[PDB]
Design an enzyme around this catalytic site. Structure first.
Site, PDB file in Angstrom:
ATOM      1  N   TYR A  85       0.798  -1.215   0.000  1.00  0.00           N
ATOM      2  CA  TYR A  85       0.000   0.000   0.000  1.00  0.00           C
ATOM      3  C   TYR A  85       0.838   1.277   0.000  1.00  0.00           C
ATOM      4  CZ  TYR A  85      -3.598   3.270   1.880  1.00  0.00           C
ATOM      5  OH  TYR A  85      -4.463   4.325   2.104  1.00  0.00           O
ATOM      6  N   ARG A  90      -1.443   8.249  -3.765  1.00  0.00           N
ATOM      7  CA  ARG A  90      -2.297   7.259  -3.122  1.00  0.00           C
ATOM      8  C   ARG A  90      -3.626   7.876  -2.693  1.00  0.00           C
ATOM      9  NH1 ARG A  90       0.486   4.555   1.957  1.00  0.00           N
ATOM     10  NH2 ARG A  90      -0.836   5.958   3.195  1.00  0.00           N
ATOM     11  N   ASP A  91      -4.685   7.065  -2.697  1.00  0.00           N
ATOM     12  CA  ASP A  91      -6.012   7.520  -2.284  1.00  0.00           C
ATOM     13  C   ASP A  91      -6.419   8.804  -3.021  1.00  0.00           C
ATOM     14  OD1 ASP A  91      -5.844   5.519   0.080  1.00  0.00           O
ATOM     15  OD2 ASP A  91      -4.162   6.872   0.465  1.00  0.00           O
ATOM     16  N   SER A  97      -4.280  12.633   1.331  1.00  0.00           N
ATOM     17  CA  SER A  97      -3.784  11.279   1.562  1.00  0.00           C
ATOM     18  C   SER A  97      -2.536  11.327   2.435  1.00  0.00           C
ATOM     19  CB  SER A  97      -3.441  10.609   0.233  1.00  0.00           C
ATOM     20  OG  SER A  97      -2.807   9.356   0.445  1.00  0.00           O
ATOM     21  N   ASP A 137      -7.845   0.667  -2.046  1.00  0.00           N
ATOM     22  CA  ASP A 137      -8.226   2.033  -2.389  1.00  0.00           C
ATOM     23  C   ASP A 137      -7.490   2.599  -3.601  1.00  0.00           C
ATOM     24  OD1 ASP A 137      -9.754   4.356  -1.987  1.00  0.00           O
ATOM     25  OD2 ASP A 137      -8.203   5.319  -0.775  1.00  0.00           O
ATOM     26  N   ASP A 317      -8.305   4.573  11.570  1.00  0.00           N
ATOM     27  CA  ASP A 317      -8.488   4.808  10.135  1.00  0.00           C
ATOM     28  C   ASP A 317      -8.083   6.243   9.801  1.00  0.00           C
ATOM     29  OD1 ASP A 317      -9.835   2.266   9.458  1.00  0.00           O
ATOM     30  OD2 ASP A 317     -11.557   3.074  10.537  1.00  0.00           O
TER      31      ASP A 317
HETATM   32  O1  LIG Z   1      -4.043  -0.213   9.928  1.00  0.00           O
HETATM   33  C1  LIG Z   1      -3.231  -0.583   8.831  1.00  0.00           C
HETATM   34  C2  LIG Z   1      -2.933   0.639   7.977  1.00  0.00           C
HETATM   35  O2  LIG Z   1      -4.110   1.449   7.926  1.00  0.00           O
HETATM   36  C3  LIG Z   1      -3.994   2.639   7.142  1.00  0.00           C
HETATM   37  O3  LIG Z   1      -5.211   3.369   7.187  1.00  0.00           O
HETATM   38  C4  LIG Z   1      -6.188   2.934   6.255  1.00  0.00           C
HETATM   39  C5  LIG Z   1      -5.995   3.712   4.962  1.00  0.00           C
HETATM   40  O4  LIG Z   1      -7.011   3.331   4.050  1.00  0.00           O
HETATM   41  C6  LIG Z   1      -8.333   3.684   4.474  1.00  0.00           C
HETATM   42  O5  LIG Z   1      -9.258   3.336   3.477  1.00  0.00           O
HETATM   43  C7  LIG Z   1      -9.186   4.116   2.281  1.00  0.00           C
HETATM   44  C8  LIG Z   1      -9.494   5.588   2.374  1.00  0.00           C
HETATM   45  C9  LIG Z   1     -10.802   6.091   2.255  1.00  0.00           C
HETATM   46  C10 LIG Z   1     -11.066   7.466   2.351  1.00  0.00           C
HETATM   47  C11 LIG Z   1      -9.999   8.364   2.573  1.00  0.00           C
HETATM   48  C12 LIG Z   1      -8.677   7.879   2.695  1.00  0.00           C
HETATM   49  I1  LIG Z   1      -7.083   9.257   3.033  1.00  0.00           I
HETATM   50  C13 LIG Z   1      -8.413   6.481   2.595  1.00  0.00           C
HETATM   51  C14 LIG Z   1      -8.679   2.980   5.794  1.00  0.00           C
HETATM   52  O6  LIG Z   1      -9.895   3.493   6.303  1.00  0.00           O
HETATM   53  C15 LIG Z   1      -7.582   3.183   6.840  1.00  0.00           C
HETATM   54  O7  LIG Z   1      -7.797   2.312   7.929  1.00  0.00           O
HETATM   55  C16 LIG Z   1      -2.885   3.527   7.703  1.00  0.00           C
HETATM   56  O8  LIG Z   1      -2.709   4.652   6.868  1.00  0.00           O
HETATM   57  C17 LIG Z   1      -1.578   2.750   7.807  1.00  0.00           C
HETATM   58  O9  LIG Z   1      -0.602   3.542   8.451  1.00  0.00           O
HETATM   59  C18 LIG Z   1      -1.786   1.448   8.584  1.00  0.00           C
HETATM   60  O10 LIG Z   1      -0.603   0.686   8.559  1.00  0.00           O
END
Ligand SMILES: OC[C@H]1O[C@@H](O[C@@H]2CO[C@@H](OCc3cccc(I)c3)[C@H](O)[C@H]2O)[C@H](O)[C@@H](O)[C@@H]1O
Ligand SMILES: *[C@@H]1O[C@H](CO)[C@@H](O)[C@H](O)[C@H]1NC(C)=O
Ligand SMILES: *[C@@H]1O[C@H](CO)[C@@H](O)[C@H](O)[C@H]1NC(C)=O
Ligand SMILES: *[C@H]1O[C@H](CO)[C@@H](O)[C@H](O)[C@@H]1O
Ligand SMILES: *[C@H]1O[C@H](CO)[C@@H](O)[C@H](O)[C@@H]1O
Ligand SMILES: *[C@H]1O[C@H](CO)[C@@H](O)[C@H](O)[C@@H]1O
Ligand SMILES: *[C@H]1O[C@H](CO)[C@@H](O)[C@H](O)[C@@H]1O
Ligand SMILES: *[C@H]1O[C@H](CO)[C@@H](O)[C@H](O)[C@@H]1O
Ligand SMILES: *[C@H]1O[C@H](CO)[C@@H](O)[C@H](O)[C@@H]1O
Ligand SMILES: *[C@H]1O[C@H](CO)[C@@H](O)[C@H](O)[C@@H]1O
Ligand SMILES: [Co+2]
Length: 363
Positions: A85, A90-91, A97, A137, A317
């Protein structure tokens, strides 16, 4: 060395990594006591995916694999689970992001450098079966969010990078699952074929990698696997659960050139249904959730290779701090648990909520 035939989740056991276990045992348990503390300890033993969200996180992938190698010498028959990821820009649909790479700043080249480190690790640990979720995403945005400039401008980079990741990680001990959003995103009838068309094109364009077993759904989301009644927030969408979603898009993948595609679905935060979501699109620290179906290949549905816990419950999140850089208003909504820390950071109150509403229960 850790080669396999068919479902990669069969014949092995998902490793519950030390990273998550440390969070639970050192950040959560010290705040709990009695039943809760004992139940919490059990949660640390449920295998979840380790996210490699930054280049700095990659060394942790090797340490995890090193732990597995050691365990495997002693009757261990474990497999590693990681999420790739770190795409540039990204995103693309999010207003802000946390992604570290930018397309305009040599982002694609940096992404490839990132993938290079991962492949070197996987090759060094060929003896360990490695299960990967490819870029959550990302591709989903290309189906419904091209109306967003950042996404329109990132499409080619997203496609180039993903093609690099899938072809470079197409190894005998690897099983990859392309993130495919969820029922509430691509499950809508109107999004189904365009989605199938896209995923199938990525597959074929990567020369049908043998390691690319299929797609991953509900990653970091809260949909039910097989709930029997439509939640209020899913109104209008006949595909209101993940089982319905994979059975809908599955045949379409085959229609577009991708036969024998299978799926894995995240249930780490799907234990309580319906959720507290006011809107299906509310993705940040949703209230009214609980740990869900435990990781297992005995899904009773051949299209689904395994139930999985991709997003680790307890890890935030996104922050609800409106003064923080990259703050997203979705994390301050009435159906989002607050106050919440930075994305990825431990969110104790959410962990407790998940443990409390877990089904199957831990208590
Ligand atoms: O916990 C593991 C991992 O989580 C990451 O956080 C996630 C990033 O993706 C999100 O889903 C997509 C999204 C939707 C709307 C806006 C955005 I900006 C992204 C998840 O909801 C979220 O849990 C985190 O960044 C990372 O550090 C961690 O290792
Ligand atoms: C196919 O692979 C090339 C490799 O550079 C990439 O640029 C292109 O976007 C890919 N096409 C699709 C549909 O994935
Ligand atoms: C949904 O799946 C779970 C786990 O496979 C199972 O226990 C449950 O009985 C299923 N529910 C229905 C309605 O089939
Ligand atoms: C690697 O070897 C194992 C055991 O022979 C096979 O099951 C697998 O298909 C791959 O060829
Ligand atoms: C993984 O987990 C254990 C072995 O360590 C077994 O219960 C299972 O069959 C698989 O080998
Ligand atoms: C074990 O590892 C976790 C994850 O980094 C930490 O949060 C904890 O403090 C301990 O070092
Ligand atoms: C973290 O450490 C505690 C205590 O050793 C365990 O109970 C838990 O399962 C996790 O490994
Ligand atoms: C969680 O992290 C602490 C250190 O912060 C350890 O002492 C504990 O054993 C667990 O790894
Ligand atoms: C665990 O949670 C307690 C409150 O329930 C905190 O006081 C502690 O610092 C840790 O976060
Ligand atoms: C949780 O429960 C276990 C026994 O099931 C205890 O050993 C622990 O101290 C905590 O009370
Ligand atoms: Co090394």
């Amino acid at each position: 060395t850790a080669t396999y035939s068919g479902n990669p989740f069969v014949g092995v056991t998902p490793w519950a990594n030390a990273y998550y276990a440390s969070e639970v045992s050192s950040l959560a348990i010290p705040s709990l006591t009695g039943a809760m503390a004992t139940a919490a300890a059990a949660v640390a033993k449920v295998p979840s995916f380790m996210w490699l969200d930054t280049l700095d996180k990659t060394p942790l992938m090797e340490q995890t694999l090193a732990d597995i190698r050691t365990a495997n010498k002693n009757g261990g028959n474990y497999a590693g689970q990681f999420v790739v990821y770190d795409l540039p820009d990204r995103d693309c649909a999010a207003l802000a992001s946390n992604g570290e790479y930018s397309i305009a700043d040599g982002g694609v080249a940096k992404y490839k450098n990132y993938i290079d480190t991962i492949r070197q690790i996987v090759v060094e640990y060929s003896d360990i079966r490695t299960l990967l979720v490819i870029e959550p995403d990302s591709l989903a945005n290309l189906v419904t969010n091209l109306g967003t400039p950042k996404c329109a401008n990132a499409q080619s980079a997203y496609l180039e990078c993903i093609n690099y990741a899938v072809t470079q990680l197409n190894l005998p001990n690897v099983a990859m699952y392309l993130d495919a959003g969820h029922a509430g995103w691509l499950g809508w009838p109107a999004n189904q074929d365009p989605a199938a068309q896209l995923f199938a094109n990525v597959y074929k364009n990567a020369s049908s990698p043998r390691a690319l077993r299929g797609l991953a759904t509900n990653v970091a989301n809260y949909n039910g696997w097989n709930i029997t009644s439509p939640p209020s927030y899913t109104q209008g969408n006949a595909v209101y659960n993940e089982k319905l979603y994979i059975h809908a898009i599955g045949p379409l993948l085959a229609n577009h050139g991708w036969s024998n595609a299978f799926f894995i679905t995240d249930q780490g935060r799907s234990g309580k249904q319906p959720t507290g979501q006011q809107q299906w699109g509310d993705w940040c620290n949703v209230i009214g959730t609980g740990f869900g179906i435990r990781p297992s290949a005995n899904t009773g549905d051949s299209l689904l290779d395994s139930f999985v816990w991709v997003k680790p419950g307890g890890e935030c999140d996104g922050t609800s701090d409106s003064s923080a850089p990259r703050f997203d208003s979705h994390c301050a909504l009435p159906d989002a648990l607050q106050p919440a820390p930075q994305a990825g950071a431990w969110f104790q109150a959410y962990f407790v909520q998940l443990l409390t509403n877990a089904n199957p229960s831990f208590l």
